[PDB]
Design a protein around this ligand. Structure first.
Ligand SMILES: C=C[C@@H]1C[C@@]12NC(=O)[C@@H]1C[C@@H](OC(=O)N3Cc4cccc(F)c4C3)CN1C(=O)[C@@H](NC(=O)[C@@H]1CCCN(C)C1=O)CCCCCCCNc1ccc(F)cc1S(=O)(=O)NC2=O
Ligand SMILES: C=C[C@@H]1C[C@@]12NC(=O)[C@@H]1C[C@@H](OC(=O)N3Cc4cccc(F)c4C3)CN1C(=O)[C@@H](NC(=O)[C@@H]1CCCN(C)C1=O)CCCCCCCNc1ccc(F)cc1S(=O)(=O)NC2=O
Ligand SMILES: [Zn+2]
Ligand SMILES: [Zn+2]
Lengths: 639, 639
């Protein structure tokens, strides 16, 4: 689907800065236009009201380029007269994207006066005075609730003369009140428009003399983890190769022994081998467990699957970026098949067939014909363990050799040879390396989001979301490996890649405390190195907030920490910490869900309201907001 | 737009109760079908997945009728083979709506076994066990979060034999956790299947021997406030006529004097006239101020505009319904042009013209041609005081004679003779009597909603919503009275009439305390009489909750109460009480917005966090959730 112009904000060309909205399309015209990518409507004005099916925001024409926010548009095309217009610019680090404006259309020009008295144009066509405080910051003269500014991103920041100062990107807000605005400066778009549109990162970089951070954007079939380290090693270099998966790590070592005749050093929690070879294959977790970089150990560190937004990868890459120069490394290679802002393109070996309602197996509102899976090795992706169980049971009833695989299950469940239908969650890609005849994708995943809810503090909620380009690629990538494959899907609608939630940062401080004997200040240092490095997945800088939160979570119960860590669920430090305050109060947990099992044995001795620190799921008990830790966490929000 | 079948939930006919979902339409087909009302698709199954543009829910086929919830479907038609199917049944009191099922619809049959082990079918095709506890209630064996059950209303409650027990209507929940389900019993559906096709009450009821509550559903201008009381008075009865508007109340005294030859008693806060006549015209407010019903004063009480969901009307009607029998009244007449579940029908002397983008005056994304309003008397409805000011200023710049009118302005602003463009909010409806050449409607209104947000307690937020059938009728009704009128609109979309928010109940307890020297217990009594009376607008029974809240708001500062009451804003009791808590704890208000003007004489003394009781707007200051009143309000939320 394309981004559709559904209206426009008309700015006054004389006197005071005033604006008015003019709708040009309704929901029907907007949906039709999104599907076709053809918009024959005359585009007028500098500020556009744009829409996707799920979202609405603004776009501004400055110097012939129609600009918007990456968070709203993603890598989507813009519906135009001749059909879909492809993005000319996509800068995930600045959250800015730009399409070539349909010829004739009016543009704003950059401001020359250097004024600090600014005017933000909203989707409501209101002109809000802003005082410039920095390069990308300006303070609202009168604070507005956050909800007032929703849908105004991509809107312009004007000077008194009506020229462009920047594009509205984010709201600087405390407890749901916006007091300042964050914007992309116009001079940044002027730099972008002056520079090369295409960049090359398909071939590995040559080893420089000074320390350097390089990007490697090559397909899974380029051997970023095999051919590339082998090649560097043949050149006589010390190489460390990091990956999120144990299975991937071991398998690449097993490949290098059989194929390239080198027996590498292997470092995983399960298996460690030390041969003294010039190549080491390690997981990010083992690398973090080991204490990260040790002096003069490696020349080149390859961070494979650097698009991965799991807390271990973020913390691992962050560690590499903070320590590598110091430990005498000359090159850091951020390698990935799917960099941020990626658009899934067809694969020559993979036939893609949309799932219809013609079939004997119900699957996500659609159907799977029994012929597509009867005989052969097939992988079906489900968003949850529940769905896996149901689907594998339905298939076993139909005489199909079906197996469910998810977190907490052994990889032996998957037969390595016979006819099989593997029904799995994303847990498969880090647990098993095998490939299949066909892949059936539900096109949905499960994500954790942080909500600064103030009931009393924050909430970490698990949500079902449409898959992004990375998810679609990793999943589809299970088939068509050096042979022909089939990929069947429920929907083609993908979400923008390269962005992650603040709850992922919270997981990094959690892991740092629970597993890596890292103080919140050490973790911040490591994540800062990741944040300040361009070309990696992006996130809101909540580093100081999370650091402050964890800094106060002192004197956790060691026994609860041990249990939560072993159970393997999300948040072992926060769960153990909430249990610690409960146990010490002889108070029951927020609920009796599996999350709070470490308290089951104490159940007959637990009474009263819960000293609630934060919300990690449903709270079925009465709560008390009087605990000093709750007051501490509340004080962290109001900074 | 029509309600569209977008999918189906397929139930097992053998063994254990299992279900699966099957989508039949995408967003495009759904939107097209909604517009046309034509659905040629085959209707397989008993449970349907239905959708409007804004909402999705379920519908179940029972005894040839396809049933759903009023809150979901309103009075909307269902898209069918021959075009839009009009509702056969609309019972707002039960929240049940029914259309005649198309061919192919296999209907479930009512349960005969009388089992208490029930099974709720969700939109996620999950079969949830429920234990029947009453006629319309059942408890969930394992509590589920509220968000899990959203979109499942109109879904069936099945017995172990797969028969229909009732349809899922509402969730019984505490702090966002659903612990029980409220359902329409299947027997109450056959009671609806009995209800008349016309239900005639277009004519006033004859006075009965015993006390009775009658409904009068007649058009505006049909003399429900004039001919009907005069007719009863001629028979020798004492008549009280109640209205929400002072302007209407005064107006009726002039018409009745000149036309029906009766100089009536007039009772308003502004003006009271006592002639000793057998007819009295009073506002609901004055009636409440007077102490309500006094013994043997009236024989007939007419509650005009009984569709009005303002706190005064609800409290006024409630007072009448609780006191009338006792005070010796023989008849209570609930009169309205727009009863709950009303659908706006064409008016014979009103030409309706959709606004386009062809015009010189911007108006809500559309445009007003200057010729439509230059000369003549016109009324333009805006959703806010802000929009009125802007529009009246834009028109005055174009040499038009424009005037803005809203709450807190004197009605003298409107010229009674002369070319004029009145730019007004719904405040006009109660302030001004008159008729216009044309009406231009923005089709949106402002409503207050209560959010049980737990940050720490509840929130009363102002929101913009699409207008309902009552709003559209009252607004359009300002033209076409005794002369050809024109009605111009932004959108045809109208939401369901006859339902109101729990914050309206909160306003009743507020008014009871602030103005009517009514204890929370007295208010509850009066509102219960309104709730338990069928045929009136419906609401969630939160009387005990609000009563308990206000009961704890003890020893308010009389001076703050006086100040808030005099300013004329929304919750004078809640504002004054929060100020009282601030002044006493010597802390600043939640913000320095006009809402907290009363605490200005204390601005230098008050410092620290705010002892926050509830949220009435934006909170810019630090908060403390330790105040005993906050803990009291929090304890009230638990049931
Ligand atoms: C309140 C109105 C704001 C203008 C607004 N923008 C946002 O929400 C953005 C989105 C999200 O930000 C991002 O994704 N990024 C990516 C990114 C990359 C580089 C630099 C950046 F600043 C950002 C910000 C959080 N936002 C923010 O502004 C957030 N604040 C911050 O990021 C701040 C800014 C200062 C630095 N730090 C640390 C922050 O936390 C406040 C979040 C308000 C909740 C609403 C989120 C829904 N937004 C949304 C989501 C999807 C869409 F397709 C369109 C929209 S929108 O509706 O079109 N967005 C907006 O209108
Ligand atoms: C969450 C699952 C629940 C089944 C569900 N139902 C509701 O939300 C209903 C809506 C609203 O209720 C009503 O409007 N009515 C109208 C009405 C008239 C007469 C008798 C009645 F019982 C009702 C109930 C509050 N609801 C409720 O259930 C609420 N609870 C109560 O009313 C309870 C029940 C017991 C008595 N008291 C006092 C209550 O407060 C819980 C509030 C949940 C937040 C709102 C969710 C969105 N609702 C919504 C709005 C518009 C739509 F078109 C469709 C939906 S939906 O998504 O289709 N709704 C549902 O699926
Ligand atoms: Zn300038
Ligand atoms: Zn039965």
């Amino acid at each position: 689907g394309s981004v559709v112009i559904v209206g426009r904000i008309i700015l006054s060309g004389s006197g005071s800065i005033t604006a008015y909205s003019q709708q040009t399309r309704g929901l029907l015209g907007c949906i039709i236009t999104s599907l076709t990518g053809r918009d024959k409507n005359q585009v007028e004005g500098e500020v556009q009201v744009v829409s996707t099916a799920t979202q609405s925001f603004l776009a501004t024409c400055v110097n012939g380029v129609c600009w918007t926010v990456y968070h709203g548009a993603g890598s989507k095309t813009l519906a135009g007269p001749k059909g879909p217009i492809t993005q000319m610019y996509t800068n995930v680090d600045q959250d800015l994207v730009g399409w070539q404006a349909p010829p004739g259309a009016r543009s704003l020009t950059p401001c020359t006066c250097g004024s600090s008295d600014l005017y933000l144009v909203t989707r409501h066509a209101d002109v809000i005075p802003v005082r410039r405080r920095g390069d990308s910051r300006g303070s609202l003269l009168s604070p507005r609730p956050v909800s007032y500014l929703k849908g105004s991103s991509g809107g312009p920041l004007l000077c008194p003369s009506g020229h462009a100062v920047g594009i509205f990107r984010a709201a600087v807000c405390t407890r749901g009140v916006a007091k300042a605005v964050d914007f992309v400066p116009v001079e940044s778009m002027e730099t972008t428009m002056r520079s090369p549109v295409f960049t090359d990162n398909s071939s590995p970089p040559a080893v420089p003399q000074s320390f350097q951070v390089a990007h490697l954007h090559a397909p899974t079939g380029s051997g970023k983890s095999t051919k590339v380290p082998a090649a560097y090693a043949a050149q006589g270099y010390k190489v460390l190769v990091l990956n999120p998966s144990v299975a991937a790590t071991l398998g690449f070592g097993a490949y290098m022994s059989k194929a390239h005749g080198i027996d590498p050093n292997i470092r995983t929690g399960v298996r460690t081998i030390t041969t003294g070879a010039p190549v080491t294959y390690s997981t990010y977790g083992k690398f973090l467990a080991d204490g990260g970089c040790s002096g003069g150990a490696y020349d080149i560190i390859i961070c494979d699957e650097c698009h991965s937004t799991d807390s271990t990868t973020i913390l691992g890459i962050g560690t590499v970026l903070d320590q590598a120069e110091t430990a005498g490394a000359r090159l850091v290679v951020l390698a990935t098949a799917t960099p941020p802002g990626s658009v899934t393109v067809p694969h020559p070996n993979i036939e893609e067939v949309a799932l219809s309602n013609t079939g004997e197996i119900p699957f996500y509102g659609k159907a799977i014909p029994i012929e597509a899976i009867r005989g052969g090795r097939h992988l079906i992706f489900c968003h949850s363990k529940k769905k896996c169980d149901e689907l594998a049971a339905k298939l076993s009833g139909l005489g199909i050799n079906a197996v469910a695989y998810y977190r907490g299950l052994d990889v032996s469940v998957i037969p390595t040879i016979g006819d099989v239908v593997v029904v799995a969650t994303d847990a498969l890609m880090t647990g098993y390396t095998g490939d299949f005849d066909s892949v059936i994708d539900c096109n949905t995943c499960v994500t954790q989001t942080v909500d600064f809810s103030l009931d009393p503090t924050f909430t970490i909620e698990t949500t079902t979301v449409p898959q992004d380009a990375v998810s679609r690629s990793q999943r589809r990538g299970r088939t068509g490996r050096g042979r022909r494959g089939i990929y069947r899907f429920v929907t083609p609608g993908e979400r923008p890649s390269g962005m992650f939630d603040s709850s992922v940062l919270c997981e990094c401080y959690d892991a740092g405390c629970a597993w890596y004997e890292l103080t919140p200040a050490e973790t911040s240092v490591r994540l800062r190195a990741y944040l300040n490095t361009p070309g990696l997945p992006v996130c809101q800088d909540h580093l100081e907030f999370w650091e402050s939160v964890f800094t106060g979570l002192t004197h956790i119960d060691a026994h609860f920490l041990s249990q939560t860590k072993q159970a393997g669920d999300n948040f072992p430090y926060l769960v153990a910490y909430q249990a610690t305050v409960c146990a010490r109060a002889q108070a029951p947990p927020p609920s009796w869900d599996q999350m709070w099992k470490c308290l089951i044995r104490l159940k007959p001795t637990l009474h009263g309201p819960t000293p609630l620190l934060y919300r990690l799921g449903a709270v079925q008990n009465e709560v008390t907001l009087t605990h000093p830790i709750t007051k501490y966490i509340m004080a962290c929000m109001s900074a």
